[PDB]
Design a protein around this nucleic acid. Structure first.
Lengths: 674, 669
DNA sequence: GTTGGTCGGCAGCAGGGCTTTTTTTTTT
DNA sequence: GCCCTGCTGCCGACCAAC
């Protein structure tokens, strides 16, 4: 009864199902962000009754997937876990696992790369045509290769990359692109963005699999489609939205979102997709999302102001019947910004002064630089604490080494990731010679395979290791340790990996003031083995239906090695002791308590984001998304004298702090800083 | 406490202990300089403390910056890292606009330095080919654009509005070259640039940076002005100075007793900037200085008397005392400049070496290339002339040649140099060396070493890369045989040097600012220098060291290795140093013997600057800084009738020679 | 018939040869 | 002491118009 039409804003009631046509839905502020998605899945279950197992929706965050899954198993219920809904990268690995290698070219025992290893591989391959370590930095190479990968130039681009005429700024990476694809194929692994490029190329070049793998799933549902790059736009045009031309009615293809949450657009997202969706299936109605669950009249007015007047976008009057009052804290004055901290003093002092139960706080970052470091060295006073989003697992050098050693267990041939560093515990490896016996053997034809096992036994090249084949003995022992293996139990670093055990004993022996490093290494060993203990079988696999070819059998961490969606952990007793989270990761979470830096342009537009580029509106929009936030007590603060990070810099007065009105919402009143 | 309070009578360190802006000293050469600077900062240490940069300090270039930093590390207990106190305004502005953001696009970092002032030279050469006339000379006319920028005068607007005479080319090239370099600025090697300019405009721009600048690090210390101007004066008045505009507390601006040197008077530095503090910040009463250690009591007192000639009105009550004293020498040998001065300095130096070590024996010259073969003087005290080569260690210019004889006419012993050939702009990209092939190629040969693998076409290391053998063998054959056959005279552009200049000209035809363009002039002047050596080495009116051409060119190359080695290892023990002292380096070297010549007229001036009584005044103070640039002992000698090539320029009398009461300066002959 | 003009080229004769410093937005 | 170029004075030949 009420379950079909559970209590909500009648706005989504008139939005309703409207099954039988492509559907577009708008967003803005909270607007039950992805809660309308839960009501949509409830619609599909009950209001229309499409089924249970015919669901494959698409999202942009693993945390979003987890929260919507728990909401579904709560309200929708009926376990509903045999079938699943997964985020964009997780759908990528899904279509590369259930559809792993039922196709020519790539094989089912593939792999995935990361950011740092992509940078390292691109830098190494560029060293073959060296263009200085600083002229074309690996970060620059990575962003350029991504923003040329985002357009659909499939990996036969001897015409596409060479189509350029004259021009400057390194199209040579397009020449390196074919060799890059060759090297990654040598390890049978892909990158972030090409992980959809291969799929869309197959779906466009291989027609037999199309309208054939749809016999498994016919349903699709989209959220934050407003945040979308051209690559995944073509994907939704062909893969998840599926039907382009021809004509086959799928199961309720549907999208939601608006251009105002246009965060994550600088390095590739064509925000126009929602604007020009009439180029796609026109038979849908624009919705009017107007109300909210957790806003306030003052803050909603501020959001509408910071969305209204920068330049041309489409937006409507947005407000809610919720309670008003508690004007925004416009208290900008003298007495120092953050040089003498004094901000965390405001947060925590107001916390014990008021009824704050250490369960709610929110402050956003501005930069990936030492802003975090200073913010820490000023909140160390606050004892109730938990650091989040600081990048703390699966990037360090030593832990990457051990991750690689898990990875070298399988897939003989793993590019530069295969070696990572061969001379890892200062073995004594003469990194030379073998650094180029690879090109020696690739002149013969083999890239990095038999040449590696070409050792004391492999005198086929016999290319004078140094003069003494001692390095041949070392690499003999290396392939020996590669060969030995055991089951998914207490051996991942310890039992049959006694060489990594001796790595551990060496590092524990040396350990100059690296005691916390020792305990974090121990914690990572513990989590690695508990993943071999808590996940294992039964609890993870169980009697679950559906067919998976090879994942699970020593493919344990082959999946979830990426998990690249900014996972976050939310306790309840200490839910808001310290929740310093950078705004980019923040996507309208549940902390009414706000003390965000927010504004005062000169730092809010970054050192590169000067003058008037074509993305300042994106900055205003990310500020709007940050202020979307949650319920009352948004006790924001600012000063007037700016200086930070050693050498001082000055900060002009923002138009965003001025586009919000002066009288109807509170602004500077007196001299105290907070 | 006063653990850093050394033995010193009250007068000098009054500027160290007496706090307050209106403090001045009168100090000549042989003063505390950085000693008193460090003592003042240590007094402030006993006082307020670091505060990162509570009081700043303007200074001279790196020659002063390095020793200042050393004194800061040593004299006060604190280790280092107070703040940037690097080479005066040239680094002050650079570190300032790093965070300041008004108009910069790529952090400015411009210098109009040797390469870039040569870029100025080439662009005005183009304008000469295209606008009016030679306009005096291609050199020494950049003074116009310099003092145009130096005193921050308007680019060309009222200069043309001034309606001056036929010099409008200056206004044209000021309208140009103000925006011609505006698209992008890069590279930093010199001092002046527009860096000292256009930063007052930043201070005259948004006053937030100006307000905070003396809010977080308050004020600055000002050293010897010298390399300044009235525009630099208003900078120091406002760059760190507050001008009592909005700042509540006043400025702690004490001033060092800038003596009269004008080492860059050619580059522009007035006199009223130091002598006329009256129409400035409060009168800043001065204090006297007494202690000195440069020269003996006789020499020191006589120098005090000599500096008191007062041709230009100068505040001088300073006296300097010392220990022993002695009279000046009287050795003149009726010109014979080369032979006479060489034998005089040789006999005196040997007599000294029988008593005192050669570790700092040297001589002062007047910016000319003359005198006997340098081998004898260089082997007198071990190390070669480590004075100036325009820091020539840059690009391939100093190394490709200096290995050209390694590869042919002797063994290529410097295998690291050989790898540097393998690091050629050719061997890097053009005739690329294939690092991932070369490193192993020279690694091959078990008993590897030198270019032995490159030798014999690499028959033994043919286990190397196979398809690469085409290009690898071709570049190997080039680099070995083409150089090996080189047995001719080998100058100008030939052998392979013509190919080197050829592809330098190839990159010259492209965009880069003098890059591969100035080095063409550099190799032209280098072959001019080797021709000059041939004037005294190969065709030395009868060969000096040309026992068949091979050893002559090799002797030239060893002279070059000496020049490029300059200051190196083999510490200064025994036969320590021989150097040729120039005016522009006249600071830092103790120089405990002074066998200087040219104190007479004829060259001071040399018909360029004859009457010009003010110019004669700074030439007199040039003589003062020359005489005060000494240590320990000194016995100056001269020659008469300088018969040079046909122009004698007889100088029997000078306004410096015989105005002394002869208490010290008397020739006894 | 003849001296002044105009260049063309070359031996003497003298002015003139001086200059100090490099770093950071898509971030998932 | 020694070289580059500008300045200066000095042989030597072809044209002309008076």
């Amino acid at each position: 009864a009420d379950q079909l039409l559970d209590g909500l804003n009648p706005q989504q009631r008139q939005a309703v199902v409207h099954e039988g046509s492509p559907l577009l839905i708008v967003a803005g502020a909270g607007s039950g962000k992805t809660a309308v998605l839960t009501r949509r899945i409830a619609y599909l279950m009950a209001a229309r009754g499409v089924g249970v197992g015919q669901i494959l929706a698409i999202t942009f965050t693993n945390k979003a997937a987890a929260e919507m899954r728990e909401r579904v198993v709560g309200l929708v219920g009926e376990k509903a876990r045999y079938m699943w809904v997964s985020t964009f990268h997780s759908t990528c690995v899904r279509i590369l696992r259930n559809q792993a290698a039922l196709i020519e070219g790539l094989n089912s025992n593939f792999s995935i790369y990361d950011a740092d290893d992509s940078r390292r591989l691109l830098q190494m391959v560029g060293r073959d045509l060296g263009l200085d370590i600083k002229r074309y930095s690996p970060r620059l190479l990575a962003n350029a290769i991504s923003n040329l990968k985002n357009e659909l130039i499939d990996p036969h681009q001897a015409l596409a990359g060479l189509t350029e005429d004259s021009d400057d700024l390194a199209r040579a990476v397009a020449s390196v692109y074919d060799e890059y694809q060759r090297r990654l194929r040598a390890a049978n692994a892909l990158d972030f963005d090409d992980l959809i490029g291969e799929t869309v190329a197959v779906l466009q070049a291989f027609p037999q699999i199309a309208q054939y793998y749809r016999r498994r799933f016919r349903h699709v549902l989209v959220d934050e489609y407003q945040d979308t790059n051209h690559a995944q736009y073509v994907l939704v045009r062909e893969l998840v939205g599926r039907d382009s031309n021809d004509g086959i009615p799928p199961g309720e293809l549907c999208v939601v979102g608006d251009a105002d949450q246009s965060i994550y657009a600088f390095r590739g997202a064509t925000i126009r997709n929602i604007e020009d969706f009439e180029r796609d299936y026109p038979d849908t109605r624009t919705i009017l999302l107007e109300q909210n669950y957790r806003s306030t009249q003052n803050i909603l007015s501020a959001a509408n102001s910071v969305i209204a007047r920068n330049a041309g976008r489409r937006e409507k009057r947005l407000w809610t019947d919720a309670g008003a009052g508690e004007l925004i804290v416009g208290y900008v004055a003298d007495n120092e910004h953050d040089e003498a901290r004094f901000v965390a003093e405001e947060i925590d002092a107001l916390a014990e002064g008021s009824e704050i139960t250490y369960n709610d706080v929110a402050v956003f970052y501005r930069t990936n630089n030492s802003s975090r470091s200073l913010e820490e060295v000023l909140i160390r006073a606050g004892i109730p604490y938990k650091v989040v989003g600081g990048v703390r697992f699966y990037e360090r050098k030593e832990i990457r080494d051990i991750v690689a050693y898990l990875r070298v267990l399988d897939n003989p041939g793993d590019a530069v990731s295969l070696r990572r560093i061969l001379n890892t515990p200062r073995r004594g490896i003469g990194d030379r010679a073998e650094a180029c016996v690879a090109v020696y053997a690739e002149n013969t034809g083999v890239g990095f395979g038999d040449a590696l096992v070409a050792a004391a036994q492999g005198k086929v090249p016999m290319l004078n290791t140094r003069a003494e084949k001692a390095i041949a003995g070392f690499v003999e022992m290396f392939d020996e340790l590669r060969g030995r293996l055991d089951d998914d139990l207490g051996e991942l670093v310890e039992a049959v990996l006694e060489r990594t055990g001796y790595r551990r004993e060496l590092e524990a022996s040396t350990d100059p003031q690296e005691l916390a490093r020792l305990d974090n290494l121990n914690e990572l060993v513990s989590v690695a083995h508990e993943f071999s203990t808590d996940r294992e079988n039964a609890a993870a696999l169980g009697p679950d239906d559906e067919d998976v070819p090879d994942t699970g059998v020593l493919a344990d961490f082959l999946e979830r090695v990426s998990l690249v969606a900014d996972a976050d952990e939310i306790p309840e007793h200490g839910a808001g002791v310290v929740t310093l989270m950078t705004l980019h990761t923040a996507k309208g979470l549940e902390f009414p308590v706000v003390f965000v830096t927010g504004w005062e342009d000169g730092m809010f537009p970054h050192m590169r984001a000067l003058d008037n580029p074509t993305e300042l509106s994106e900055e205003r929009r990310l500020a709007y998304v940050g202020i979307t936030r949650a319920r009352q007590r948004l006790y924001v603060s600012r000063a007037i004298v700016r200086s930070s990070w050693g050498q001082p810099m000055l900060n002009p007065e923002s138009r965003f702090l001025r586009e919000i009105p002066q009288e109807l919402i509170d602004w500077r009143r007196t001299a105290p800083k907070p």
